[PDB]
From a paper:
As the sole target of neutralizing antibodies, the virion surface protein Env encodes a glycan shield to restrict the antibody access to antigenically conserved sites. Small protein mimics of the CONEs are designed by epitope transplantation and used as immunogens to focus the antibody response. Here we focus our protein design efforts on four CONEs, including the structural elements of β sheet 12/13/22 (CONE 1), α2 helix (CONE 2), loop C (CONE 4), and loop E (CONE 5).
The C2S5 scaffold is built on a four-helix bundle from apolipoprotein E3. The two helixes used to display the CONE 2 residues were well matched to the α2 helix in terms of the Cα-Cβ orientations. For instance, a discontinuous three β-strand motif was grafted onto CONE 1 scaffolds, while the two helixes on the CONE 2 and scaffold 5 design (C2S5, a similar nomenclature is followed for all designed proteins) displayed the α2 helix-specific residues. Comparison with the Env trimer protein revealed a high degree of mimicry: within the epitope region, the Cα RMSDs between the designed proteins and Env were 0.42 Å (C2S5) and 0.34 Å (C4S3), respectively, suggesting that our CONE mimetics accurately display the Env residues. The electron density maps revealed that the side chains of the grafted residues were well positioned relative to the computational model. We selected the most stable designs (C1S1, C2S5, and C4S3) for immunization experiments and further structural analysis. The CONE 1, 2, and 4 proteins were monomeric in solution, while the C5S3 design displayed rapid exchange between monomeric and dimeric states. No HIV-specific antibodies were obtained after immunization with CONE 2 (α2 helix).
Author numbering: 19 to 159
The structure:
């Protein structure tokens, strides 16, 4: 398991707890603690990923520059897909905080159900985009 995969694993571990939407989660969500921690976990994932990309590129047996730039761009695509998935996670959690803050004490049940439905979809993308990224990195080296 590469460093970036472990970093993504810590992102997953925290996201999974957040999705329970317990009252403890709601506490740390409305205090912006959740969006702060998820942002850091996301950044460390992308940083490790960037550095790990540079690693494989240097150990790559030389090839025609055209293929070199294509595989590079193919990996930036998968790299960008993962990044967008995580950013979207943080976003919907920020949005939820803003909505509750504007709800003046009414029931957040329906908001939490819609949030869970959206996190489940974003979650599905991260599995897919992360898997494709792992495959494209392996064939790389």
């Amino acid at each position: 398991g590469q460093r970036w995969e472990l970093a993504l694993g810590r992102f997953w571990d925290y996201l999974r707890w957040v999705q329970t939407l317990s009252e403890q989660v709601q506490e740390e969500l409305l205090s912006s603690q959740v969006e702060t921690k998820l942002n850091k976990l996301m950044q460390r994932t992308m940083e490790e990923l960037k550095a790990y990309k540079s690693e494989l590129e240097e150990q790559l047996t030389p090839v025609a520059e055209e293929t070199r730039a294509r595989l590079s761009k193919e990996l930036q695509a998968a790299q960008a897909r993962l990044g967008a998935d995580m950013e979207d996670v943080c976003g919907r959690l920020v949005q939820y905080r803003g909505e509750v803050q504007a709800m003046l004490g009414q029931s957040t049940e329906e908001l939490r159900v819609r949030l869970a439905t959206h996190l489940n979809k974003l979650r599905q993308r991260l599995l897919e985009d992360a898997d494709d990224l792992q495959k494209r990195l392996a064939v790389y080296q």
